[PDB]
Amino acid sequence: AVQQNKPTRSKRGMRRSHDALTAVTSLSVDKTSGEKHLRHHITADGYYRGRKVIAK
Amino acid sequence: MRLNTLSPAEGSKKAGKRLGRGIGSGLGKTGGRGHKGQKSRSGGGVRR
Amino acid sequence: METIAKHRHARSSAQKVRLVADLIRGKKVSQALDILTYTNKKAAVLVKKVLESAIANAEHNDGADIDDLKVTKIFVDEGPSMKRIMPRAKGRADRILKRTSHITVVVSDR
Amino acid sequence: VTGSGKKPWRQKGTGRARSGSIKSPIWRSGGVTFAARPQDHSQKVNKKMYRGALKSILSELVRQDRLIVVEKFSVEAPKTKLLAQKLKDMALEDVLIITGELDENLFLAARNLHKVDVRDATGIDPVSLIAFDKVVMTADAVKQVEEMLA
Amino acid sequence: MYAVFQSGGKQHRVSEGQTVRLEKLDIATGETVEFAEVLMIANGEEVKIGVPFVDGGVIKAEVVAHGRGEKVKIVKFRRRKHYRKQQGHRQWFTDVKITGISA
Amino acid sequence: ARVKRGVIARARHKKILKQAKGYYGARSRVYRVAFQAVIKAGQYAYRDRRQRKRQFRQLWIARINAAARQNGISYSKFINGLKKASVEIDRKILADIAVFDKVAFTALVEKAKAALA
Amino acid sequence: MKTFTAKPETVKRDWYVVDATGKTLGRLATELARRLRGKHKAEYTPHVDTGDYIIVLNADKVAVTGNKRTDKVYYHHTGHIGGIKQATFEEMIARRPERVIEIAVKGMLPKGPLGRAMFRKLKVYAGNEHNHAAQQPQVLDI
RNA sequence: CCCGGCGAGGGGAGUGAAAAAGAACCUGAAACCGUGUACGUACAAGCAGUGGGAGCACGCUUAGGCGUGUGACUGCGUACC
RNA sequence: GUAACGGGGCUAAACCAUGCACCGAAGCUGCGGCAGCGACGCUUAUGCGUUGUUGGGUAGGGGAGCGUUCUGUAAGCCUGCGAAGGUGUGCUGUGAGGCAUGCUGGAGGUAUCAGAAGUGCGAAUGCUGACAUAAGUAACGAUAAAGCGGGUGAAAAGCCC
């Protein structure tokens, strides 16, 4: 459209409260090693439930 | 020395209207000419 | 012991930086550095080097310890825009402004 | 303002200000609407007010004891070090020397001193005469001033 | 214990151990305020009095500050018409502290 | 004589905007909206000098009314009774004993009832 | 001097049991509203919701007196269908039997919010079954 | 010297009377976005102001009914040209 | 959307007859502050005391005062022993205004009182600058599309292979 007036700065922050960037919910270690993790993927060295993955 | 203690004769200084200064002043807008018409604008039209 | 890191004229609009930054306000340095790591975004790696640089000069130099270090200020400001002609109706040649950000990390033990 | 009679104009009633002239006084810079014209404020000076105001100041100058009135006050030459060395001896500072006799050896003197000045008694300046500490005078100046004042 | 007195054309309720405010006095901080013009003392039970200036009553007092307040502002105004005008006053006062009021 | 124009207003502005502290949004930060609000604020403040005293007298009247009504007389027969009863300059604000220690108020009513006709 | 005023922690309230079987709708209702503000008592304050806590013991046999009963239909227009829509005096007694007493005392209470704060202190229940035995009600005749 | 890609920016170390003079460097508002503190916002609605006010922090209030900031709640209340 | 008592309520809480009452405005009045002016006293270009009616006010008149730039006393005096400027607060006057003061600041500053005036902005759908806003909205320029691994490189779905 257009608008009536220039808006207040409280308005700008209420409009931005829901669009806000969302939590990662803490971190992972492997179930099967002393190696640090990426949640519910397999690491660059294939550790998750072992075997081998990403041999590139 | 006595300098800078002078002032004009009694009531001699009228001081006069400045106009156009403040809005809470009484004096201001138009000049003491009122709203709109030939005599409110800058000097043109009617002959003496 | 207090440290500023800035990166000024960095390639992001400051609105897009302020988004990520408000996730990590007040967090303490180690908890925020984990929160940033599991943010996949390219903005989050750009900011990492400046946040990490803040943290590194307390871990060294004039500082001692990083365990009570906290992100005391974290803020982003309008950097220098290069102005470009936007193609638009009836040969309308309106400005589109290609933004950069001035990014400030302040960490302190404070 | 010279160098363009151009109208930015292209009517009013197109969503904007009147944009009236590129020489209009409000047009950023280059000239404002009532900026100064050559000023001359000197008048006639009415002789009977002038000469009679002065009769007041000459009486007031003796009543405040500021008029010394030395007979043939003079120095050999128009040299400040000579007049000034005369002035230290008389215990005087920053005084208005008034000539009665328009001799060049006093009248070109006193030049280096900031707030010592020399003037002639013919048409004496009423604004200088209320400044300075004292009026040195001669009796020759008293003669010709009263004679401008009858 | 509560009482009524006259500050002037206005009447005031006040208690024992109460500091209370009225329009400025001539009386100073280092002087004694006393009120024989006590209109009632409300005692242990409601009083049945008709006639004021009760003789068997005092509010004994003191001034504790003579000062001037803050400046209040007065607007006289009429919209759209280009009439606006202003007056100030800050007003002097006395605070008094009640030591009196007999049982 | 170049006169600067506006280093006087910077102080006039600052007096208005200091009086407009405690006010919302633009009111504390824009001279244009500070100015509208500061004039309006003092007109009301000066109005309520008088208006406060009238608004309370209504609360004053209803509190002499609740004591009297518990004591089975109406406020207007009691106040008119007191008027007929001898002198007393009196006041509506008088009965503190109405809200608390409600055992009193009776001597004034008993007087008011006695003068009643 | 300045005026004294009341405060929310000092307000007493108490629980009152109001017998209604001799009464009629509006002569109960306007005394309840008064009391429900604290306008029966010395409030001496503009801003603190005082009131009493009121239990109505029954009220099922309250006559309206005169012919007003059969034209009182509590008109509302929530957001649908041409016409005003209504509900009968008879609905109010047959089901949720309070509602005739509730929406008699509603109209005596202020604007939006403040009138709701006065109202949530009043209860009627279904009638001759009130639950404030442990509360120890002081009886009141009006 | 620290971080970094050879980068960009900033800090530390050192320079000075001063870098709260660090290079767009003169002292420096307001528009601007962010931090830090006190206090508030889910019986809860309007020119956002006025009048009354629960509360809390601070000021040893010599505590002697007071100063400060904010303020649930609520009487009253229609911007300037 | 009741919505022709403002509403609840009221079949007497209505209306009518007689009469008493209360509440209800800066009105009527006293308290304390104060403006101008008649009368009188002092006796002044702009008053104050005693006494007095008085003081809502635009267009519009008329009188007075403040500051801003600069001059004159000011070639003097204060100044890195902390000046202009910046800003929060308090004091004070009817208002304009003026004064105190912590922080800041690294050189400047000052009345009285008169006179000269480019003389106080908030508006002209005004002019210029800094810079906000609707907005995390819309946009991917005939979709002569593209893939993923390795490599230059620190990094690669788009380069190079």
Strands of G138-140's sheet, edge to edge?
G122-123, G53-56, G15-18, G138-140
Q: How distant is the Cα of E89 from the closest Cα of chain B, in angstroms?
A: 19
Q: Does C25 touch chain A (CB under 8 A)?
A: no
Method in brief: cryo-EM
Chain centre to alpha carbon of residue D14: 58
Structural contact between residues G19 and G90, judged by C-beta atoms closer than 8 angstroms: no
- Tokens for E86, please give them: 């202003």
- Helix, strand, or coil here: E15? strand
Buried b (16+ CB within 10 A) or exposed e, F88-115: bebebbbbbbbbeeeebbeebbebbbee
The residue segments making up the domain with residue D32 are 1-149
Structural contact between residues D92 and D134, judged by C-beta atoms closer than 8 angstroms: yes
CA C73, CA E86: separation in Å to the nearest integer?
Answer: 47
Q: Identify nearest nucleotide to residue B32 by CA to C1′ distance.
A: I60
CA C17, CA C7: separation in Å to the nearest integer?
Answer: 12
The residue segments making up the domain with residue C40 are 1-110
In E, minimum Cα distance to F82 occurs at E50
D32-CA/H21-C1' distance, Å: 38
CA D53, CA D62: separation in Å to the nearest integer?
Answer: 15
Q: Is residue C90 part of an annotated ligand binding site?
A: yes
Written as one letter, the residue type at D77 is: A
Structural contact between residues F57 and G3, judged by C-beta atoms closer than 8 angstroms: no
Interchain touch C–A (≥3 Cβ pairs closer than 8 Å): yes
CA D121, CA D101: separation in Å to the nearest integer?
Answer: 9
- Helix, strand, or coil here: C90? helix
Chain G residues with CB under 8 Å of E20 CB are 1
In F, minimum Cα distance to G7 occurs at F99
Which is nearest to D94 in space by CA: A5, B1, C50, E85? B1
C37-CA/H5-C1' distance, Å: 20
Q: Does B23 touch chain E (CB under 8 A)?
A: yes
Report the DSSP pairing between strands C70-78 and D96-99: unpaired
Structural contact between residues D66 and D136, judged by C-beta atoms closer than 8 angstroms: no
CATH number of the domain at C43, please.
Answer: 3.90.470.10
CA F62, CA G40: separation in Å to the nearest integer?
Answer: 9
What's the per-residue H, E or C state across G67-109? HHHHHCCCCECCCCCCCCECCCHHHHHHCCCCHHHHHHHHHHC
- Tokens for D46, please give them: 């009415």
Structural contact between residues C65 and C10, judged by C-beta atoms closer than 8 angstroms: no
Where does C1-110 show beta strands of DSSP type E? 3-10, 70-78, 82-87, 93-98, 101-108
Other C-beta atoms within 10 Å of A7: how many? 10
Chain centre to alpha carbon of residue F40: 19
- Tokens for F45, please give them: 């403040």
- Helix, strand, or coil here: A36? strand
- Tokens for F114, please give them: 């006695």
The conformation of residue G33, written as its DSSP 8-state character, comes to H
CA G4, CA G128: separation in Å to the nearest integer?
Answer: 42
- Tokens for D125, please give them: 């300046």
Strands of E38-41's sheet, edge to edge?
E11-15, E2-6, E38-41
Which is nearest to F115 in space by CA: F86, F72, F73? F86
E vs G, Cβ pairs < 8 A, gives: 6
| Binary contact (B2, D130; C-beta < 8 A) | yes
Q: How distant is the Cα of G2 from the closest Cα of chain E, in angstroms?
A: 9
- Helix, strand, or coil here: E74? strand
Cβ-proximal residues to G34 (8 Å cutoff; 6+ apart), any chain: G40
CATH number of the domain at D81, please.
Answer: 3.40.1370.10
**Count of structural domains, chain C:** 1
Residue with tokens 């008293």: D142
Helix residue ranges per DSSP H, D64-97: 80-89
Report the DSSP pairing between strands G15-18 and C93-98: unpaired
Burial zone of G53 (CB within 10 Å; 0-12 exposed, 13-18 middle, 19+ buried)? middle
Residue nearest to nucleotide I25 (CA to C1'): F54
Which is nearest to C99 in space by CA: C84, C80, C85? C80
Structural contact between residues E44 and E83, judged by C-beta atoms closer than 8 angstroms: no
CA D120, CA D101: separation in Å to the nearest integer?
Answer: 8
Which is nearest to C33 in space by CA: C11, C19, C51? C51
Report the DSSP pairing between strands E72-78 and E83-89: antiparallel
What backbone phi and psi angles, to 5 degrees, belong to E40? -160, 165
Q: Tell me the β-bridge partners of C74.
A: C105
User: Taking the C-alpha atoms of F79, F81, F84 and F88 in order, what is their torsion angle to the nearest 10 degrees?
Assistant: -50
Cβ-proximal residues to D34 (8 Å cutoff; 6+ apart), any chain: none
Q: Does G39 touch chain F (CB under 8 A)?
A: yes
DSSP D40-55: -------HHHHHHHHH
Structural contact between residues G44 and F98, judged by C-beta atoms closer than 8 angstroms: yes
- Tokens for F96, please give them: 């503190």
User: Within 13 Å and on the Cβ side, how many CA atoms surround C84?
Assistant: 9
Which is nearest to F89 in space by CA: E69, C69, E6? E6
**CA angle, residues G129, G130, G133, in degrees to nearest 5:** 120
Integer-rounded Cα Rg, in Å, for chain B is 18
Q: What share of chain G is helix, strand, coil (3-state, %, to 5)?
A: 30, 10, 60
